[PDB]
Amino acid sequence: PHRRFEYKYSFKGPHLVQSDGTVPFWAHAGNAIPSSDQIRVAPSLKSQRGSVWTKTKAAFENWEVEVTFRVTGRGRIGADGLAIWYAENQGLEGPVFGSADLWNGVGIFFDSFDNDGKKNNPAIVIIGNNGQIHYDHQNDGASQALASCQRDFRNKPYPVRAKITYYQNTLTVMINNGFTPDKNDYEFCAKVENMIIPAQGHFGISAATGGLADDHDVLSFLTFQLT
Amino acid sequence: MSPQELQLHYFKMHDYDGNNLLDGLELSTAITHPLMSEDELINIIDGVLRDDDKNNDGYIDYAEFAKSL
Ligand SMILES: [Ca+2]
Ligand SMILES: [Ca+2]
Ligand SMILES: [Ca+2]
Ligand SMILES: [Ca+2]
Ligand SMILES: [Cl-]
Ligand SMILES: [Cl-]
């Protein structure tokens, strides 16, 4: 399968922000702070929300995004986590990891905080939605999850990497857990066969905190069209 | 310094991740270095890739670059 880099649906350093503090081709909101080499989507302060979404919609039959990020916090426990989005509408502000609920498309949620006390966090949870599901915060989306894995993406020596592929109707999530310098040491995390998502969507990334708070940083969001 | 080297120097100067490929985000920083309109930035970059990205991979490699010149 051929890969085409798509600049208009991507961002990265080392000149990530423009002199007016904007990120080219993306809109940010809440308390996201863009800087020259990363976006602090939500800093380690109480009750924060931030997001970053593409200004325009992508129309790709198949795609792959690589998101390189850090979640960092004093505790062995942190909150709330970080979400990667492909959705019909920009979800700039809202209660779902800092973005709009009732989205149409897919959220991949990197959920640090064990809301339902099931000792199964940090987790990565894939959640499809059609415009009508209210995200179940209290249960870490457990009943709404098309698929999930357990993976501790917090406080790692190198950046964590999520490779998210939509190809021939299957959504795969692969994670490089950041233990070593090898940027290609990916491990399988989850997969959903026969996933339907809009033919046009905004990509996005968002994060939030509560009483506990980590710094949520995205160094780069890199989007490819597959054919 | 021959044309051929000023060109190399330009290519390398905007190759910020050092992969010997120029992508649109790299070209945008070259172009943008009040701010110019994003829409016009998108046209320019789209034009450069239309004209020079012969294999349609979203990058311009050195051969594609040297050929554009
Ligand atoms: Ca949670
Ligand atoms: Ca849980
Ligand atoms: Ca490059
Ligand atoms: Ca090329
Ligand atoms: Cl850059
Ligand atoms: Cl909390």
CATH number at residue A127: 2.60.120.200
SS3 label, residue A100: coil
Structure tokens at B24: 């649109």
Report whether A112 contacts A78 (CB < 8 A).
yes
Q: Name the one residue in this structure whose structure tokens are 């829409």.
A: B39
CB contacts of A19 in chain B (<8 Å) are 35
d(CA A213, CA A110): 14
Q: Phi and psi at residue A103, in whole multiples of 5°?
A: -90, 160
Largest Cα–Cα separation, chain A: 45
Identify which of B27, B25, B16 has the alpha carbon closest to the alpha carbon of residue B64.
Answer: B27
Instruction: Please report the beta strands in A31-144, taking only residues with DSSP state E, as ranges in sequence order.
Output: 33-34, 39-42, 49-54, 62-72, 81-87, 104-111, 123-130
Q: Which of A2, A14, A20 sits opposite B16 (nearest CB)?
A: A14
d(CA B35, CA B37): 6
* Type of residue numbered A43: P
Burial A169-207 (b: 16+ CB within 10 A, else e): eebbbbbbbbeeeeeeebeebbbbeebebbeebbbbbbb
d(CA A3, CA A66): 13
Peptide bond into A24 cis (omega under 30): no
Q: Phi and psi at residue A21, in whole multiples of 5°?
A: 75, 15
CB contacts of A25 in chain B (<8 Å) are 38, 42
Report whether A223 contacts A114 (CB < 8 A).
no
Report whether A217 contacts A38 (CB < 8 A).
yes
Domain count, chain A: 1
Q: Phi and psi at residue B44, in whole multiples of 5°?
A: -60, -50
Contact check, Cβ <8 Å, A7/B17: no
Task: Show Cβ contacts of residue A115 under 8 Å, excluding neighbours closer than 6 positions.
Answer: A137, A138, A139, A140
Structure tokens at A104: 């149409």
d(CA A57, CA A201): 5
Report whether A163 contacts A66 (CB < 8 A).
yes
Report whether A69 contacts A183 (CB < 8 A).
no
Task: Show Cβ contacts of residue A74 under 8 Å, excluding neighbours closer than 6 positions.
Answer: none
Report whether A85 contacts A41 (CB < 8 A).
no
Method used experimentally: X-ray
Task: Show Cβ contacts of residue B36 under 8 Å, excluding neighbours closer than 6 positions.
Answer: none
Q: Does domain B1-69 have CATH number 1.10.238.10?
A: yes
Structure tokens at A86: 């492909």
Contact check, Cβ <8 Å, B16/A20: no
Q: How far is the CA of B38 from the centre of ligand 4 (A)?
A: 23
For A149, the domain range is: 1-227
Identify which of A102, A101, A220, A25 has the alpha carbon closest to the alpha carbon of residue B16.
Answer: A220
Q: Name the one residue in this structure whose structure tokens are 């592929």.
A: A165
SS3 label, residue B10: helix
Structure tokens at A157: 């020596």
